[PDB]
From a paper:
Crystal structures of 11 Mpro mutants provided structural insight into their altered functionality. We employed crystallographic structural analysis together with a high fidelity FRET activity assay by our group to assess the functional and structural changes in Mpro mutants. The crystal structures of several variants revealed the changes in side chains orientations of residues in the active site comprising substrate binding pockets, especially S2 and S4, which might lead to altered amino acids preferences. Accordingly, changes in KM values for most of variants were observed, indicating alterations in a mode of substrate binding. We observe the highest level of conformational plasticity around the S2′ and S3′ binding pockets with N142 and S46 being the most flexible residues within the structures we solved. Also, we observed that the charge distribution in the active site changes quite dramatically even upon a single substitution especially around the S3′ and S2 binding pockets. This might explain why with most mutants we see the changes in binding affinities and not the kcat values.
Residue numbers in the entry:
A (entry chain A), B (entry chain A): 1 to 306
The structure:
């Protein structure tokens, strides 16, 4: 039946992507109810990125200085505020395409779907993960600021990510929908250390379980490890330590497939110290880490979101 | 700015995914205007897959024997016909969410976005490619028949794929929207040879150009090849022969980046005979082949579809 990096259907989010232009800079906004959410750096200019006094810069801005454009119907702002690193612009009308929504601050290792947008128009959707150092690698060209990451819980859209900036290292950073950055990043153009990044071990094991369900089983062995033994191998290869909670999350995959979690760990232990030896695991010769154990269950069971 | 397997925004397609149930079997349909398109094997049963007489089976079926369900509004069929391997059911009402659409029979090597559906409800979207042997690897669980692949040309949705069956080899086959299968496949459950599969060489080179734009340039060398010399290496590694047309399609990427096409070919020639030696190319140690040269341009320029 096969397995893939699946992205949520982006229909419910496309109807909220608007275009926010403040004087010089243009970027994307999120129109829910009668409010538009956008990155607060839309009020800056090119030179302002070096060191922005956002409170004084916003003071210079009036309501009519904000031009919000949803397709071809232009929205009248009548209120504005700065919550952390985002703007909250009250507009004339409620978004009639507003879905049921939850603002959620997700955790590292969690995955979500990103809808890349430019001047308020959708371009593409893909699945990525919040890396342990609170970065996400991205496909964010010039003017993609304000793109949103999200999950969908059956009928509700859980907004978690808003893309702000791009680091000089090439990876990207953003906030939740309340403006607080993920990680130590601030919205200015300075040298911003990404910090060391490890591999989400829970995601790697759940990915191995999915491969067992979809044909590839050459890595299965009849050697074990203990939780402490596998851990001493994990940090030598810069893998996250595996708590008992991570074992319990893998419980459903452990039962349906009949391989104990620690049996999967020793397969991973053997893959770290000996590589893959030319073979692959579902079309990839790398240890994929952007699949949560929940994501594996949706793809192997067939959970729908409408 | 990074690069990824991007999928088209699936909003315009979500509004057409309906549920078609005929007696025993349930699968997905495509509701455009006043017509529902679905795989013709919905009128079969479990045993009928061995050898179906579709013309005699459809004769036993009447209009009321077809239950089309769009969310919670049930559609009245008033006409039915069998065009090749698909059904055409005229319904009571036009789909008010119908987009501008083109039915297109795509070619091997071309890519498109698939919206996986179950009982008529969307589940996920991802980008795949029509392999040279007219197969696509898939993530198609039980009841995903009728899922559609599509491209979007700025404002028009080009429907190209409809998933029918799953081969015993694990890969999948389908038709266009006129019912003609891609490849030699027929809609019955028998041993169906997938045929040999090669690697889309044009896609691999365009993928290398994208990596040059996004940081990774370690594979760039100051050795060349000729078109005939690279070809003798290509078929030894089961790669498609490179025509002059394939060189010309890579023209825009060749100019913007300043590396001649044949210079990229010798980098590929060197990657085939010596592997990757531990290094990667945009987070992958495999020669990706599901990126058309057009796809590379959209992601590096920022083309929008609304």
């Amino acid at each position: 039946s096969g397995f893939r990096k699946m992205a949520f259907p982006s229909g419910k989010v496309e109807g909220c992507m608007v275009q926010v232009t403040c004087g010089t800079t243009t970027l994307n906004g999120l129109w829910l109810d009668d409010v538009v959410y956008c990155p607060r750096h839309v009020i800056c200019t090119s030179n302002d990125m070096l060191n922005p006094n956002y409170e004084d810069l916003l003071i210079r801005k009036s309501n009519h200085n904000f031009l919000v454009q949803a397709g071809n119907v232009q929205l009248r702002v009548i209120g504005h505020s700065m919550q952390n690193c985002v703007l909250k612009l009250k507009v004339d009308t409620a978004n009639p395409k507003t879905p049921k929504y939850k603002f959620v601050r997700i955790q590292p290792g969690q995955t979500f779907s990103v809808l890349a947008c430019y001047n308020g128009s959708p371009s593409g959707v893909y699945q990525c993960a919040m890396r342990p150092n609170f970065t996400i690698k991205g496909s964010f060209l010039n003017g993609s600021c304000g793109s949103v990451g999200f999950n969908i819980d059956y009928d509700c859209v859980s907004f978690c990510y808003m893309h702000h900036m791009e680091l000089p290292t090439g990876v990207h950073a953003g906030t939740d929908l309340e403006g607080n950055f993920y990680g130590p990043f601030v919205d200015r153009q300075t040298a911003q250390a990404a910090g060391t990044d490890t591999t989400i071990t829970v995601n790697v094991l759940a990915w191995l379980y999915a491969a067992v369900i979809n044909g590839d089983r050459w890595f299965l062995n009849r050697f074990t490890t203990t939780l402490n033994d596998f851990n001493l191998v994990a940090m030598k290869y810069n893998y996250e330590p595996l708590t008992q909670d991570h074992v319990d999350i893998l419980g459903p995959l452990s039962a349906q497939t009949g391989i104990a979690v620690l049996d999967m760990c020793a397969s991973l232990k053997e893959l770290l110290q000996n590589g893959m030896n030319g073979r692959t695991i579902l079309g990839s010769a790398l240890l994929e880490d952007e699949f949560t154990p929940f994501d594996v269950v949706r793809q192997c069971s067939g959970v729908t979101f409408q």
